[PDB]
Design a binder for this molecule. Structure first.
Ligand SMILES: O=C(N[C@H](Cc1nc2ccccc2[nH]1)C(=O)O)c1cc2ccccc2s1
Length: 145
């Protein structure tokens, strides 16, 4: 199995799914490296985020736990089709890339914080990460190219 994928078993179901420790993604189907990628993301800052401040809110005061409850709620809407990544990124992302629908443009290794970079490079085109953690907050990353 490819970059950082692993067999896991469902607690509710008893069915084998697959989990990516690098991207924190999980899917049911058995999964199937480039020089540059392009990613969008939705960032939710928390009180130990680097700059606890954003265009949404001048002091960010939510805790690491509450940030992850948000990221998990957003992930549910996105995965359920009830809203899409872009619309949620524009509305809710604490990153100023919110206005470009979360788009960060194309990049290569060396450019971005490493947790984010590894997740970016381990995603497949069109694939969405689970929650990924950097000193900035907790990201949901969507690899577009
Ligand atoms: O790194 C940035 N600044 C942070 C948010 C952030 N933190 C990151 C950590 C890793 C990768 C991208 C990231 N973006 C902020 O706005 O507080 C960027 C802002 C913008 C705005 C427009 C285009 C690219 C970028 S990259």
């Amino acid at each position: 199995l490819p970059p950082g994928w692993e067999k896991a078993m469902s607690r509710s179901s008893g069915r084998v799914y697959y989990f990516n420790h690098i991207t924190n993604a999980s899917q049911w189907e058995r999964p199937s490296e480039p020089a540059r990628v392009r990613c969008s993301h939705l960032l939710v800052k928390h009180s130990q985020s680097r700059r606890p401040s954003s265009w949404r809110q001048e002091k960010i005061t939510r805790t690491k736990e509450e940030a992850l409850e948000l990221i998990n709620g957003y992930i549910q809407k996105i995965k359920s089709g009830e809203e899409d990544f872009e619309s949620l990124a524009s509305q809710f992302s604490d990153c100023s890339s919110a206005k470009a629908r979360g788009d960060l443009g194309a990049f290569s290794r060396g450019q971005m914080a490493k947790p984010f970079e590894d997740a970016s490079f381990a995603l497949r085109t069109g694939e969405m990460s689970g929650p990924v953690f950097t000193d900035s907050g907790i990201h949901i990353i969507l690899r577009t190219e």
